[PDB]
Amino acid sequence: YQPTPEDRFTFGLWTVGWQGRDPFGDATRRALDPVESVRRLAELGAHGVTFHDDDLIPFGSSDSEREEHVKRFRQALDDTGMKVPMATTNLFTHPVFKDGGFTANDRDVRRYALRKTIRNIDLAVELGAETYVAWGGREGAESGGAKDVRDALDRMKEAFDLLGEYVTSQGYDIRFAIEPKPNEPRGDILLPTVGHALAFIERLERPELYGVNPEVGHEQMAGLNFPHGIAQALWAGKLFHIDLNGQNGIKYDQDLRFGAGDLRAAFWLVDLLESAGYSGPRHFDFKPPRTEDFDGVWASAAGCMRNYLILKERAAAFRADPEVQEALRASRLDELARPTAADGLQALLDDRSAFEEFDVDAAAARGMAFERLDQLAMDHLLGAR
Amino acid sequence: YQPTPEDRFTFGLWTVGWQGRDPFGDATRRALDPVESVRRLAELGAHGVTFHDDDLIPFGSSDSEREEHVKRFRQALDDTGMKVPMATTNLFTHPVFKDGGFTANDRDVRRYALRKTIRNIDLAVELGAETYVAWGGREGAESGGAKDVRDALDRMKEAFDLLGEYVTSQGYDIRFAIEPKPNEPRGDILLPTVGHALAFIERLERPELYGVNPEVGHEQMAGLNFPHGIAQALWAGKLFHIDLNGQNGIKYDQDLRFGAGDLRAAFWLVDLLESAGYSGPRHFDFKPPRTEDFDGVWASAAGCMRNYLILKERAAAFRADPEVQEALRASRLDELARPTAADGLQALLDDRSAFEEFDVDAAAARGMAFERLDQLAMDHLLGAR
Amino acid sequence: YQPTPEDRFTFGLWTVGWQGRDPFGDATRRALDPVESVRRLAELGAHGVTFHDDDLIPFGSSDSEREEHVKRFRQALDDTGMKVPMATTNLFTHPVFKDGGFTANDRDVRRYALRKTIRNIDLAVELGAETYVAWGGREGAESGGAKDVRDALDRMKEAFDLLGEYVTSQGYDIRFAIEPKPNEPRGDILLPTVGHALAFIERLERPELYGVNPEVGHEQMAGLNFPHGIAQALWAGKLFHIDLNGQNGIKYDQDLRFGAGDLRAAFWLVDLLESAGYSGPRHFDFKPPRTEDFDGVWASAAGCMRNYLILKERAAAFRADPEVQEALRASRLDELARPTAADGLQALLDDRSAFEEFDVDAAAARGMAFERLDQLAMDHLLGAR
Amino acid sequence: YQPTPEDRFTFGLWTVGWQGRDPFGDATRRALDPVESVRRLAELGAHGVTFHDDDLIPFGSSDSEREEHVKRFRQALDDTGMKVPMATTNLFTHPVFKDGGFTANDRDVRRYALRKTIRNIDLAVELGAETYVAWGGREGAESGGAKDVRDALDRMKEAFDLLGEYVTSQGYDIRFAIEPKPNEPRGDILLPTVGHALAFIERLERPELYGVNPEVGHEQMAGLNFPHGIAQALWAGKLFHIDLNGQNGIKYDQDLRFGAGDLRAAFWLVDLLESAGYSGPRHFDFKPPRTEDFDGVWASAAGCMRNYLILKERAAAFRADPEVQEALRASRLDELARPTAADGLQALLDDRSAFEEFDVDAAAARGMAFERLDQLAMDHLLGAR
């Protein structure tokens, strides 16, 4: 289960670089030079890294410092062959963003947030990024009167439309991916789930430029089924990017390494991504627990990749097993993929076998055989057949 | 705080008619004649009732029985002046729907579910309903292999498109409202939230025919902010109907009377509905607890209406208070409603006060004053100023 | 992974016998004769069955009917070799228990609940049960004024003390196990968790007669760590019985087959039970989903046993692996088992290496190596080393 | 609703002193001199403040600095009349505590944690504290193998027994209160709820020295009913202290001002505390949101006190209302307070009206009238009768 770059595994600079500061604790690890992270991740078999503007260039840097930080970063990519498929803006750390970025009540902050993002889009395009992610972690509220949500969605649409106008006017190929999160650090965050983000996108001026970057832990933070939400994003044609990690149910954002947390949901996610032929980066947005030293950071990163590859093998064995293929037919998954009424409405209305002469009790008595199917899946996941 | 029919309060036959059967207990109350519910609700000041097909006509009824049930029902509406603004199909009680209705794996069940709905749409139009609600309570799964969600969404789109084709071919004015629910009775239910339903609707053949019927308890069952989700539905122009009740956080669907559960969220919901000028029915989808006798059923129904009216008065006093209007300006809610960059992208890019000369520390040091605003709201809710 | 009776796997009559009625649906399966369940479970390798009084003898039965039901049941145990290690009272289904049994506000109901339990304790002793379980599923409330909780705990202590007085006066060996549940069917249930039940027991007249019967899904329904709670019950010497099943986080009580739901927590539970040498029944309190027919019921029951045995093998391989034993030392699990200050308080107060000369930064810089340990556990669970 | 010191309102130095650093954001406010907090809180009507050792004396301070910090603090208490009823140890911020304090796997860290606490107990006694709080925020784990919970509970019992041995050997009157929390910053925290802490205390060498310091938000973080848990703590005689704040369901620890979050649960909490005659400090453990400036900090603190006083008035009006007293009798709250079987077990066994001649259907048909009672409570809370 050794990763190679063709597996497309990517890591944020902020993941292995996390110093371990949490709400109740100081840092447990020194800061990492982005150059060293690139080298250490390449040695593990990663394909690429991603960054926030302020991860790569310290906030407030001068032009000459900015140029030296990028030049050092570019040399580490050249030395390793690592790519930069995705980038994003930090619109959450600085105190100026305390009431939001694009939806801050203060107009001058909203304008500043847009300028900060536009500057980093240029940098991301230069480094080769195909996707620009927006995480509105500060867009939201802790109380009901502090944010008019219809007004905030107006401001959010304006911000995204202007960013779409900007990349069009430069002839950039980059697309945007919205990363939903239901809460934390705000009491409730706007566009809290995959669904809310997909619905918002359909009201933008150029919807085709925008998709979702769903994160395993963020949907599980709302108790939602992450493979189900990914399926709806695939159905809509909007899975531009994905964040992989682990999460133990409804609580603070844990960002455990992928495969920790809900192991079965991870299996069904990997099964769906491979079956659907998702071709984007397999991006890990995780935090090595602050109990770990620097050797534990890299063990945690390696674990993400390994667990993905183990699940990929087991899911593929599951789908290829003729006994599973037989069980899927017994459970009528083939019938689910058949059109309900390709004969059309009138034919359905006149079809007496659909109502007047439908034997509802005979239909009701037919078991679905889902438990035998699910136990075959569990045996395949555990390597027990 | 006495309701009148112009307040547009509506109740499902299945709410005050609930016999008190739960997963662990037998019925604690006798069944109610729909006629008596209409009379008792009218006496309380309700505007109308809603129904499932099988609430009004017992499942399996003959044509002559069906006609007598409707004739009795119609006479109770005539005697009281009560309206029927909304109707829906029971696609969840009969064992034939155990794997779903529109997305059942068995094609013959999906066709039957469509025919059952189409039959009731006719009845609902005859009784005057403006909205037909779809609650896919059985569309979902308890295990990952039992439902391919992309296939199920294909079947769901087909079902809704055919229903839209049907009402168009009859020249009906009725529109559809999807009622989301994240789980129960299925382990996870498809279109689990307001957002997922809004996103799905945008892929239907005629999206303008479909909106959402969000329920307070269903979004709170996912830990989501119900006023926020209602705001996004209003923003999208899709709040066709609403279900009001109470719910104590993330657990089984409690269906408490409106105002119980999260009292502050109820206040902010009523504030939003009145401020936005929502003109649909104020529909209560609640269950009088099975501890109650028939007198407790009607006290519970009266409580729903009363609590709405109390919250309506307090929210209106909050918005009209000049000290609150002053606090809203101090918190820059006026600036949130102003366009971020009506001067356009180029002007924003050249505006040095948006970036090069933006004093980020002065902006960051400005408090939002949200706590004083929120305490004014709490004083208004409690009648303590 | 074939179970045998020496594995001590037990099932409630109400589990495989569940007809599939849920809050929104009618039964999908016919009722089962308890005799047939005993035979079918024995054929699967089960050790025993458990029952509610009303599972074995239909409520309201005459003495002659009661005797024939028991005689038939006893013959099925004799024919199979199955045991009856545990029994319990149904104090939740009949409408008389709608406000509780032992803590019903109506005193005459509380007295009836006690008499109903005492009658079944006699029957359980006759059938050989070692444990009598109390599940106060109706003890609780949906609103704050309806139950004074200090008064209710007074009544609950009185009920349990009287039951302890009863079994002592008959010279019975049977002990009581309280089964906690945080909510459902009541809005909140008294003694909601393992901890609350353990604390309550310490106030009973004869605490040694009472322990806990924790259920996987019930603690996960509160977002709690079930292996952690089992550990505290073992630490207190109170794990008299256990209910095994699966549950997907915070939502209604799913009662999935064991191993479904949180697979990793199931692994750590089995590891703890085997390491601690728990010698009680491995009891499954699960519901075959109502999508299943009778063949799916037995496949689901077999899956419970199989998954336990797979996890038992993987946990044992994990603990016996010398590389894991090395990682546990690296993570200082050996030091955790050493007394903190066996030298005593004064020696600790005078030990300068505990404070004045403790190198806090050197200690802080030592990584715990938990991630490498946890990835070894994951590799062992998945069969990937 | 103006607080006075006889209302016993207390605040942690760390509450109004919180600089606004969260997992995703830098500080939004400057640090506060503890002296200024004492003065500002006294001016608001507070009775007292509480502290962590490291709140009052910066970590690593020399003896002469330590003495000057305390002397300044003591003068602010003398100038204001403020008391210090409670103190606690910071065993969570420094990286040395990253795997816990009393239950850290490293023995030398456990010994250091004990010495750090013992030093602060001396200081707390000098300042007059009656309660010493233990919050084991780092005692726990993110993975299953990293902590043997039976071993950790052994170490926790040893730590608490040694602290009890220490205060006894000095003749101190101070008692200990354990503050439970289910998760955050650890994935799961040991003794996660009021119940688990009460059960643990009963295994300590001198149980009478230890009680609980429950926090509104911490039990709600597990979806539990906080008034119910407080009632069980009162029933056990262990409510030594309480932390008041607000929390919106199951998510990260919000620490909103008291009264925000679940308003009805706050009402029932205040009703219970006043009815039970709780005489300890009404301590607020809250964080003014980081959107606020220093004026918003004090408005937030004032709001805590005001909301408590409003709820106190409404709860008292509720209990004194003769129509409520009539409804409580109708709902048989009087019968709940009556002993179930003061006639004894034998008399119960021979009482034919408890079983043989109990009319179960007549009992079942009697409604509890809980909804009318609960609507009276809601009318009293809202000032709407």
Ligand SMILES: OC[C@H]1O[C@@H](O)[C@H](O)[C@@H](O)[C@@H]1O
């Ligand atoms: O892409 C933006 C990223 O910013 C991070 O700091 C957030 O915590 C992530 O959830 C997000 O993926």
Ligand SMILES: OC[C@H]1O[C@@H](O)[C@H](O)[C@@H](O)[C@@H]1O
């Ligand atoms: O509109 C359909 C209705 O069916 C009911 O039985 C469900 O429980 C409701 O949530 C829903 O509103």
Ligand SMILES: OC[C@H]1O[C@@H](O)[C@H](O)[C@@H](O)[C@@H]1O
């Ligand atoms: O032991 C009593 C049993 O009664 C069942 O019907 C409950 O649902 C179980 O959780 C419990 O184990």
Ligand SMILES: OC[C@H]1O[C@@H](O)[C@H](O)[C@@H](O)[C@@H]1O
């Ligand atoms: O008493 C100890 C205190 O430490 C704080 O920093 C925790 O966040 C509180 O929950 C706790 O009350």
Ligand SMILES: [Mg+2]
């Ligand atoms: Mg992310």
Ligand SMILES: [Mg+2]
């Ligand atoms: Mg509804």
Ligand SMILES: [Mg+2]
């Ligand atoms: Mg159970």
Ligand SMILES: [Mg+2]
């Ligand atoms: Mg606290």
Ligand SMILES: [Mn+2]
């Ligand atoms: Mn995250």
Ligand SMILES: [Mn+2]
């Ligand atoms: Mn509902």
Ligand SMILES: [Mn+2]
């Ligand atoms: Mn259960």
Ligand SMILES: [Mn+2]
């Ligand atoms: Mn807290």
